[PDB]
Scaffold this active site. Structure first.
Site, short mmCIF file in Angstrom:
data_model
loop_
_atom_site.label_atom_id
_atom_site.label_comp_id
_atom_site.label_asym_id
_atom_site.label_seq_id
_atom_site.Cartn_x
_atom_site.Cartn_y
_atom_site.Cartn_z
N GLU A 217 0.78 -1.24 0.00
CA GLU A 217 0.00 0.00 0.00
C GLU A 217 0.82 1.30 0.00
O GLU A 217 0.63 2.17 0.86
CB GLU A 217 -0.95 -0.02 1.20
CG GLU A 217 -1.70 -1.34 1.34
CD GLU A 217 -2.76 -1.33 2.43
OE1 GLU A 217 -2.62 -0.57 3.41
OE2 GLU A 217 -3.74 -2.10 2.31
N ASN B 59 2.43 -4.65 -3.53
CA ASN B 59 1.03 -5.01 -3.36
C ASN B 59 0.17 -3.79 -3.02
O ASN B 59 0.62 -2.89 -2.32
CB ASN B 59 0.96 -6.06 -2.23
CG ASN B 59 -0.36 -6.81 -2.16
OD1 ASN B 59 -0.84 -7.34 -3.16
ND2 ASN B 59 -0.93 -6.88 -0.97
N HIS C 107 -10.01 -6.41 -2.88
CA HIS C 107 -11.00 -6.46 -1.81
C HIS C 107 -12.18 -5.73 -2.42
O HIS C 107 -12.26 -4.49 -2.36
CB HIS C 107 -10.50 -5.72 -0.57
CG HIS C 107 -9.42 -6.46 0.17
ND1 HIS C 107 -9.64 -7.68 0.77
CD2 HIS C 107 -8.13 -6.15 0.40
CE1 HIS C 107 -8.52 -8.09 1.34
NE2 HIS C 107 -7.59 -7.18 1.13
N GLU D 278 -5.44 -10.84 -2.34
CA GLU D 278 -6.25 -10.88 -1.12
C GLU D 278 -7.74 -10.82 -1.45
O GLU D 278 -8.50 -10.08 -0.84
CB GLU D 278 -5.88 -9.69 -0.23
CG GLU D 278 -4.40 -9.65 0.16
CD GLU D 278 -4.02 -8.38 0.90
OE1 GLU D 278 -4.93 -7.74 1.46
OE2 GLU D 278 -2.82 -8.02 0.95
N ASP E 116 -11.64 -11.12 -1.83
CA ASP E 116 -12.86 -11.32 -1.06
C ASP E 116 -13.86 -10.35 -1.68
O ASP E 116 -13.47 -9.31 -2.24
CB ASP E 116 -12.69 -11.12 0.47
CG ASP E 116 -12.00 -9.84 0.86
OD1 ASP E 116 -12.10 -8.82 0.14
OD2 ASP E 116 -11.37 -9.85 1.94
O1 LIG Z 1 -6.80 -10.45 10.27
C1 LIG Z 1 -6.76 -9.16 9.67
C2 LIG Z 1 -6.07 -9.24 8.32
O2 LIG Z 1 -6.90 -9.98 7.42
C3 LIG Z 1 -5.88 -7.84 7.76
O3 LIG Z 1 -5.14 -7.93 6.56
C4 LIG Z 1 -4.65 -6.73 5.95
C5 LIG Z 1 -5.81 -5.92 5.44
O4 LIG Z 1 -5.35 -4.73 4.80
C6 LIG Z 1 -4.53 -5.01 3.67
O5 LIG Z 1 -5.25 -5.72 2.71
C7 LIG Z 1 -3.30 -5.81 4.09
O6 LIG Z 1 -2.52 -6.12 2.92
C8 LIG Z 1 -3.72 -7.08 4.81
O7 LIG Z 1 -2.57 -7.75 5.34
O8 LIG Z 1 -5.13 -7.04 8.65
C9 LIG Z 1 -5.83 -6.86 9.89
C10 LIG Z 1 -6.03 -8.20 10.59
O9 LIG Z 1 -6.80 -8.02 11.77
#
Ligand SMILES: O[C@@H]1[C@@H](O)[C@H](O[C@@H]2CO[C@H](O)[C@H](O)[C@H]2O)OC[C@H]1O
Length: 302
Positions: free
Chosen positions: A131, A172, A209, A237, A239
């Protein structure tokens, strides 16, 4: 576990893998382990390899959770994607407190080098920088950018490559789901520039996402990301709020349509364990049973 494996089927379509995010807390409960062993061929540590977990205190690393996942993965023949080496979130206060350029640079390099060296040769790909872009395409003003400057990205990648020449290095990010969106066009241009200057960026990871109906746009977005020239691109990632089969199938087709897309990683197994559970965005329900979206993916891949 579903009778039909989406990983086996995507491999039959010529891709490298179809995986999911996980960690010790999931593998030790419910049917997560069994589902992953049967239907997926890759895993990404959901949290165990982030900075706050691995280096809570400077020079004092903790690999308990990370080691659990890596060992479990190797023992079960699953590929691994390291996540996340340089990121502004889930970052220890001791790091963000640093204001000296030399200091932070060495700290960042040591963090990168230590994690990658511990698992040298065992990690297929690493999300080196996570990010780094603002929505308008400009670079996100994080402590790394503010203290080290724009060169922190080239430095992170050069350091990562030296640490483990075997791994594919990724940058990423999210909201790279639409070809007309500023962020998508900006990362493509910047990655093109960095690679031209010799920076070893092997892939662009698109978190993906999504909200309902955003799958359609990925059909044009992924090809655009691939135009940056990296040897690889990947859905990292995935979803979708609502878990509509239409959105899921669209994202899968986008990868099938892009030669450089090596695979897809869905962000979790069962809905209640999703970081976005209120949107039941995953492929398995609370009963650990395959949802319509999972079957749709299977049907599409066959
Ligand atoms: O369990 C959650 C994770 O799923 C979450 O993952 C982050 C979300 O933000 C970004 O996509 C990042 O790349 C991911 O790693 O992080 C918070 C945690 O509680």
């Amino acid at each position: 576990q579903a009778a039909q494996s989406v990983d086996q089927l995507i491999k039959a379509r010529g891709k490298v893998y179809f995986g999911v995010a996980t960690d010790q807390n999931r593998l030790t409960t419910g049917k997560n382990a069994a589902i992953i062993q049967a239907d997926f061929g890759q895993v990404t540590p959901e949290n165990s390899m982030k900075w706050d977990a691995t280096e809570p205190s400077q020079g004092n690393f903790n690999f308990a959770g990370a080691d659990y996942l890596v060992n479990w993965a190797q023992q079960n023949g699953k590929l691994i994607r390291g996540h996340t080496l340089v990121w502004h979130s889930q970052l220890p206060s001791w790091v963000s407190s640093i204001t000296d350029k030399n200091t932070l640079t060495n700290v960042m390099k040591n963090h990168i080098t230590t994690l990658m060296t511990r698992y040298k040769g065992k990690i297929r790909a690493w999300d080196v920088v996570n990010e780094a872009f603002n929505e308008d395409g400009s670079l996100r003003q994080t402590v790394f950018l503010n203290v080290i400057g724009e060169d922190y990205i080239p430095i992170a990648f050069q350091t990562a490559r030296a640490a483990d020449p075997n791994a594919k290095l990724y940058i990423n990010d999210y909201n790279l789901d639409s070809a007309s969106y500023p962020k998508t066009q900006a990362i493509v241009n910047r990655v093109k520039q960095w690679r031209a200057a010799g920076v070893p960026i092997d892939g662009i990871g698109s978190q993906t996402h999504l909200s309902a109906g955003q799958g359609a746009g990925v059909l044009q977005a992924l090809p655009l990301l691939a135009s940056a020239g990296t040897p690889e691109v990947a859905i990292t990632e995935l979803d979708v709020a609502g878990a509509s089969p239409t959105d899921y199938v669209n994202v899968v087709n986008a990868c099938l349509n892009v030669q450089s897309c090596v695979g897809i990683t869905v962000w979790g197994v069962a809905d209640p364990d999703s970081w976005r559970a209120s949107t039941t965005p995953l492929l398995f329900d609370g009963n650990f049973n395959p949802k319509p979206a999972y079957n749709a993916i299977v049907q599409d891949l066959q």
